[PDB]
């Protein structure tokens, strides 16, 4: 049979860049509906429209058994009181796991079951997080430097319904009085 | 529903040690039959019998779509002219990818299809390697310090060590006149 060609690629742990990867940039204007304080979001778009995160994906063709990987630079910031985050993956094939790996910065992972029972895991350099089957997840930057991480998902997991852009997550992550706080999301029904 | 608990663990990128992950120690005496030079293997066993490599492993119950992960401290050394390696596996379920991430040290990967065609990939820090479906593989240390790395594989890939001592890999990796060389395995048939 014709076997796939194996390869090695370099990754900078200080910049998350992979040479040759499929780059993708998400600005704040690409995240309408996602943050709670919708007016802060408007003010911050017109006046800067900052970069929220960069992804560097190395994805295969979507077969059972095969693996994709991805680095993300998630930049620091706030939209109101709420911390910058990724859009949030919820899988098409639900019982896939994912392994995330912290490379540089301070952050964490917001997780939730389909019904919205929530879990928060802190992430410093070196922390490897196992996302189990059936869990949604989104990564948040809770520090002052870019949070960079490597992600390893199955090729056949996908991203769709259970949508985050209209529905979202049971809890949000915010800064109250210097301190980090996982609290309830008022927009979650 | 019954859902699995997500978690974080802490991986030291300077030492390989995952906290509370449970070690496997393979000392030279556990790799009988693996290195071309059987007689240098006996000699080096009698005298010292060192730990060739350690594995700190976080596994799930094997279940299509779940992932394990594990670091390896592959210690440095040689058996005659041939550098120290992992025993290396074909998977029990063959069409399964892995992804490796090199953390410290200097090394490489040896890879091979069921029919024998080899492939060598340099690994230094930053090197992520995609091990595609249907390939066996073995990690090799080629410098004077430990080669430490992380691996993420499908939880149900299983473990075929049998084809690899019995038959071998088609190519071995040795030091010859100071420079690292990848050559044919005299054992190979």
Swiss-Prot record, chains A, B:
The family database entries (Pfam families) matched by this protein are listed as: GPI
State a GO cellular component annotated for this protein: cytoplasm
Q: How is the cofactor bound?
A: Binds 1 Fe cation per subunit.
A GO molecular function held by the record = glucose-6-phosphate isomerase activity
Question: According to its UniProt record, in which pathway does this protein act?
Answer: Carbohydrate degradation; glycolysis; D-glyceraldehyde 3-phosphate and glycerone phosphate from D-glucose: step 2/4
Q: Where in the cell is it found?
A: Cytoplasm
How would the record characterize activity across temperature?
A: Optimum temperature is 90-96 degrees Celsius. Highly thermostable.
Q: Has UniProt tagged this entry with the keyword Phosphoprotein?
A: no
Q: Which InterPro entries match?
A: G6P_isomerase_archaea/bacteria, G6P_isomerase_prok, GPI/OXD, RmlC-like_jellyroll, RmlC_Cupin_sf
Q: What is its EC number?
A: 5.3.1.9
| GO BP of this protein | gluconeogenesis; glycolytic process
- Activity at various pH: Optimum pH is 7.0.
Give me the reactions it catalyses: alpha-D-glucose 6-phosphate = beta-D-fructose 6-phosphate
- Principal place where this protein is found? cytoplasm
| Residues annotated for Fe cation binding in this entry | 89, 91, 98, 137
Q: Which family does it belong to?
A: Belongs to the archaeal-type GPI family.
Q: What is this protein called?
A: Glucose-6-phosphate isomerase
What species is this protein from? Pyrococcus furiosus (strain ATCC 43587 / DSM 3638 / JCM 8422 / Vc1)
